[PDB]
From Swiss-Prot:
There is a cross-link at residues 64, 67 (Glycyl lysine isopeptide (Lys-Gly) (interchain with G-Cter in SUMO2)). One of its GO terms (molecular function) is GTPase activator activity. Changing residue 111 to A: Loss of RHOA interaction. It comes from Homo sapiens. Monomer. Interacts with FER. Interacts with PLXNB3. Forms a heterodimer with RAC1. Interacts with RHOA, the affinity is increased by three orders of magnitude when RHOA is prenylated. Interacts with PSMD10; the interaction increases ARHGDIA association with RHOA, leading to ARHGDIA-mediated inactivation of RHOA and ROCK and prolonged AKT activation. Interacts with KANK2; the interaction is direct and may regulate the interaction of ARHGDIA with RHOA, RAC1 and CDC42. Interacts with RHOC. Interacts with CDC42. Interacts with NGFR (via death domain); NGFR binding decreases the affinity for RHOA. The keyword Cell membrane does not apply. The chain holds residues 67 to 203 of 204 of the full protein. This is Rho GDP-dissociation inhibitor 1. Belongs to the Rho GDI family. It comes from the Eukaryota. Its main location: cytoplasm. The lineage of its organism: Eukaryota, Metazoa, Chordata, Craniata, Vertebrata. Keywords: Acetylation, Cytoplasm, Disease variant, GTPase activation, Isopeptide bond, Phosphoprotein, Ubl conjugation. GO terms for cellular component: cytoskeleton; cytosol; extracellular exosome; immunological synapse; membrane; nucleus; Schaffer collateral - CA1 synapse. The modification N6-acetyllysine is found at residues 31, 53, 67, 104. It is found in: Cytoplasm.
Length: 129
């Protein structure tokens, strides 16, 4: 009944951030310039899965301004939830770069299996809130 692969959540790891930046998968405000990593949480319940891949399409006011592909790897079943972390990123800085961004995320693997496709927003401001 429960799928073999289940994406549990997307988290924005940010030390300076004053509060939670979590998204349970079962908008985000980021102060310009700050460093962060995207942490995708998932579970492999029964079988080995290979070539896990995180895909991200960043949109601005309806138009694609960027696409990036992250290789997650191969995992075997286990009770502990898995934690994928992208490399450290820096939120753009500048009045021209501030504003909201739409993100289309996709967790896939060697099948092209749509384990989960979710969408979320990332708003960049001068200060937290």
């Amino acid at each position: 009944m429960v799928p073999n692969v289940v994406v549990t959540g997307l988290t924005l790891v940010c030390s300076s951030a004053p509060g939670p930046l979590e998204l349970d998968l079962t908008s985000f405000v980021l102060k310009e310039g700050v460093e962060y990593r995207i942490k995708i949480s998932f579970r492999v319940n029964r079988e080995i899965v290979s070539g896990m891949k995180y895909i991200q399409h960043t949109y601005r006011k309806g138009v694609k301004i960027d696409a990036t592909d992250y290789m997650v790897g191969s995992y075997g079943p286990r009770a502990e939830e898995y934690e994928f972390l992208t490399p450290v990123e820096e939120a753009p800085k500048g009045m021209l770069a501030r504003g909201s961004y739409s993100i289309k995320s996709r967790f896939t693997d060697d099948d092209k299996t749509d384990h989960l496709s979710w969408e979320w927003n990332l708003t960049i401001k001068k200060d937290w809130k």
